[PDB]
């Protein structure tokens, strides 16, 4: 009984209105964050998305979505913005060029939400990365792609871990800087969580942003629970080779599904990490039949359980549920291992991963730091962001100007 099993009880059986139509997704969930320029609309403008949303609403698109039909609706706006960026860059208008390339990247991004599962969505991922990096190259402090050799890779794995890298300008072997390794989620990849990098640069902190297995350009085997372990060995080896970065001050911050990987690597890579943070992560119950058979209809904008199944390399939900127990940090013995410093943060009412997974994390191995956010769903925002920045600032002895750091996240566009 799902209603008996989990902290949120009968909330698990109440289908969210945004699943009725794209119109309801826009009106009740997406219009607000788009207006505010925040996830999933970082670098984005209401001016770009509003006319796309109007055309989708007119068509009356709804679940089950044809992802090629859905994705195509965004391309005219994405192409328009890229054209404006190109003309700006030709005129030497670098700030305008950077803004419009990044606005283009945001439109391509939403077109391949929740994850690229069609040819046009895979195309939108490639196109989105292209215009993202064109915009990033034109930032005052350019964010660059590093194609980290996946030296720890096995048969069937890609040869590179593509990451974002930003080094603060004063960083050197004389004055080496901490590094925040941002682990992205099921739908937000390195082109999304990029929004955090300039804020960390301002505090004198390097940033590396990497995708979880079965998302973005992760080379990791989708179905292999140990595939993330090899990926982080390759990433951390590369960070160790950057002498401007203090290898003893690496903090891994996992966002959403990334939180699972942050919690996992606190154990698998204990000796190589100062600390890890799981924000809206899971560990065990996220893989339950009962949780996954309900989560498709809850707070996630689309079909969470099917999307998670695809990310784990299964062609349907049932095939994933058959094998999903093997990914549990409880079942595979991860949580019995010693860990580095761990902070767990989430909203109690999370309908993407259960708060019950915070409890499983606190029931096993060494004590861990926790902040629960009462009456808030996935991520427990915005207080979760302040809690985590406060902790990382204390840990790394930063300037404590966290409100200013958070105020830098919302997108400004013309």
Author numbering: 1 to 414
Sentences from the paper on this structure:
In summary, the N‐ and C‐domains in all three enzymes are oriented in a back‐to‐back fashion forming an interface that encloses the intramolecular binding cavity next to the active site. The resulting Ser‐His‐Asp network is perfectly aligned with distances in the range of 2.5–2.8 Å between the active‐site residues.
In contrast, in the zoonotic pathogen Wangiella (Exophiala) dermatitidis (Wd), the acetyl group of the hexaketide 2‐acetyl‐1,3,6,8‐tetrahydroxynaphthalene (ATHN), WdPKS product, is hydrolyzed by the Afyg1p homolog Wdyg1p. The amino acid sequences of Afyg1p and Wdyg1p have 40% sequence identity, which explains the similarity in their overall folds and active‐site residues (rmsd = 1.1 Å over 382 Cα‐atoms, Figure 3b). Interestingly, both hydrolases provide a hydrophobic tunnel beside the naphthalene specificity pocket. The 400 Å3 cavity of Wdyg1p is confined by the amino acids Thr257, Leu304, Leu308, and Phe353, which could accommodate an acetyl group. Hydrolysis of the Ser256‐bound acetoacetyl group finally restores the catalytic center and releases the products THN and 3‐oxobutanoate. This mechanism is most likely transferable to Wdyg1p due to the high similarity of their active‐site architectures and the GLDG binding motifs.
